[PDB]
């Protein structure tokens, strides 16, 4: 049906690859199987090599490199890709260890990005960018500061963009009258070789004056619309500079991204809750 072909200026060497978004099932990473198409004159003695990379930039800290030689040799999709090509069609087969940093980049390249590089030379160029990605498989926080503040989330797993609902319970016995309630979202993006980032904040001047109870639900939504101008914002894997989502929530060595909900009063005791922000499997 659909398969991606890449070539260099001379085009003697072509790489056919089925997918370009590798799903980490957390036990078996979708194996990387591709086909190299060459000619005899352009190679003759020089063998055909291909490489998988996990290049981390910001510094080029490739946490892993493996070499598989298309020619000489050392799967059905490979079968069908080969049958159309003939003698100079040679498979390469890389297997990603399950424990690699997923594909995350930083909006100004930087971050984590896999890659398949295909070349031909005598002794161990086509640049095919791939990525690692994951699919989406009841938070409750308390604080007795008086000012009893309880927050709860309907569910922990929310897809990118879907609104998140927060139940707030404010019991105020005190004489200290509230000014605001802010339900904010914090995106922690730790660069490992953990910075707070405000992405959404539904502030309402809901004041619960002495000896009172406040019980209502807020709905907050972190979106890239207002986050376009946030330096260090962890975006998801960018293929050839497409437009990407927010760096999803890692499910555990590169950049570690987590997401929490913070319910802050301005009196100002608060709470914090985590949630998952990964796309669902289509």
């Amino acid at each position: 049906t659909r398969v991606f072909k890449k070539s260099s200026p001379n085009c003697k060497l072509t790489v056919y690859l089925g997918k370009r978004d590798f799903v980490d099932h957390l036990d078996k990473v979708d194996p990387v199987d591709g086909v190299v198409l060459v000619d005899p004159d352009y190679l003759k003695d020089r063998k055909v090599f291909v490489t998988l990379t996990c290049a981390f930039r910001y510094f080029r800290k490739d946490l892993f490199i493996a070499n598989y030689q298309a020619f000489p040799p050392t799967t059905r999709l490979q079968e069908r890709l080969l049958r159309k090509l003939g003698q100079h069609a040679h498979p390469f087969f890389f297997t990603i260890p399950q424990n690699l940093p997923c594909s995350v980049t930083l909006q100004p390249a930087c971050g984590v990005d896999f890659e398949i590089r295909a070349f031909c030379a005598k002794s161990l160029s086509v640049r095919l960018v791939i990525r690692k990605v994951q699919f989406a498989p009841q938070p409750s926080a308390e604080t007795t500061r008086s000012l009893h503040l309880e927050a709860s989330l309907d569910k922990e797993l929310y897809y990118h963009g879907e609104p998140l609902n927060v139940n707030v319970h404010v019991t105020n016995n005190s004489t200290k009258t509230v000014k605001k309630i802010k339900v904010s979202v914090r995106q922690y993006a730790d660069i490992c070789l953990q910075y707070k980032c405000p992405v959404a904040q539904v502030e309402q001047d809901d004041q619960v004056s002495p000896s009172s109870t406040f019980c209502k639900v807020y709905t907050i939504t972190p979106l890239l619309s207002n986050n376009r101008e946030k330096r260090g914002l962890a975006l998801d894997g960018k293929l050839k500079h497409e437009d990407t989502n927010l760096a999803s929530s890692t499910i555990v060595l590169g950049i570690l991204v987590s997401y929490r909900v913070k319910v802050k009063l301005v009196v100002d005791v608060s709470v914090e809750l985590p949630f998952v922000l990964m796309h669902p499997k289509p």
Partner: antibody
Framework: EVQLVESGGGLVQPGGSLRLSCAAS????????IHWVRQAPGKGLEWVAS????????YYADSVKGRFTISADTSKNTAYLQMNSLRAEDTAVYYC??????????????????????WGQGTLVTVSS | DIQMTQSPSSLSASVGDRVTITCRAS??????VAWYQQKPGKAPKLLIY???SLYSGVPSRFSGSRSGTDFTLTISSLQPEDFATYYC?????????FGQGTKVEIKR
């Protein structure tokens, strides 16, 4: 099930204004390209505007750039098209449609602007002095 | 913008006809086209995407194909119920441009 409801259709003098609300059920405005289309009386369709909240992109047809303005409310999961300076030619039956940005294989596709497969039911927008 | 012209502006047809409807774009298109079948009074329905796909629920008797920039919509058996206008529209560039209908008439 995914559906849209277009509301806010009634008479309005030329040079006046109206507001159309597209209530989207079954999906989010941040995970779908929302397109406001219309159809003149006894003619074919015409694409008016289209938005995507997640990336905050807006695109108007050259005839409704500025005279119409589209946005959305994610809390209510709704799309809003404020129609300014409605004119006689603007008379039509207006539709709302949605393109799921899913099924790239993993996540969103930011460069498809795909075909709008789920239309509403059509609300008449009149203009008459 | 792109003038997604469609021809014929009107074609005669009856039961069993294999109608061919052509849509030619002013500028290059990249398999991004959809042909919408509107009955008089109702709202359109998706028929073609990717210039060759079949949206779920679209009757198999409809088909679309690409022979370059000229997108072909073929209704092998134009059944009695499929009497409506057919407009082609490319979803590649913006602002989207619609065709000018292929009024599916009846012959007597």
């Amino acid at each position: 099930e995914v559906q849209l409801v277009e509301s806010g259709g009634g008479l309005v003098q030329p040079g006046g204004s109206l507001r159309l609300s597209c209530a989207a059920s079954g999906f989010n405005v941040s995970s779908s390209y929302i397109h406001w289309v219309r159809q003149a009386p006894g003619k074919g369709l015409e694409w008016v505007a289209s938005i995507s909240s997640y990336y905050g992109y807006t695109y108007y047809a050259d005839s409704v750039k500025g005279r119409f303005t589209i946005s959305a409310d994610t809390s209510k999961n709704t799309a809003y098209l404020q129609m300014n300076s409605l004119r006689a030619e603007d008379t039509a039956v207006y539709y709302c449609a949605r393109k799921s940005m899913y099924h790239r294989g993993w996540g969103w596709l930011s460069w498809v602007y795909g075909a709008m497969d789920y239309w509403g039911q059509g609300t008449l927008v009149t203009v008459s002095s | 913008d792109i003038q997604m012209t469609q021809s014929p502006s009107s074609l005669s047809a009856s039961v069993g006809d294999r109608v061919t409807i052509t849509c030619r774009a002013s500028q290059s298109v990249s398999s991004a086209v959809a042909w919408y079948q509107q009955k008089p009074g109702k709202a359109p329905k998706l028929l073609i995407y990717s210039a060759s796909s079949l949206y779920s629920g679209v009757p198999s008797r409809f088909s679309g194909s690409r022979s370059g920039t000229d997108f072909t919509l073929t209704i092998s058996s134009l059944q009695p119920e499929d009497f409506a206008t057919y407009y082609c529209q490319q979803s590649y560039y913006y602002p989207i441009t619609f065709g000018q209908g292929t009024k599916v008439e009846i012959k007597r």
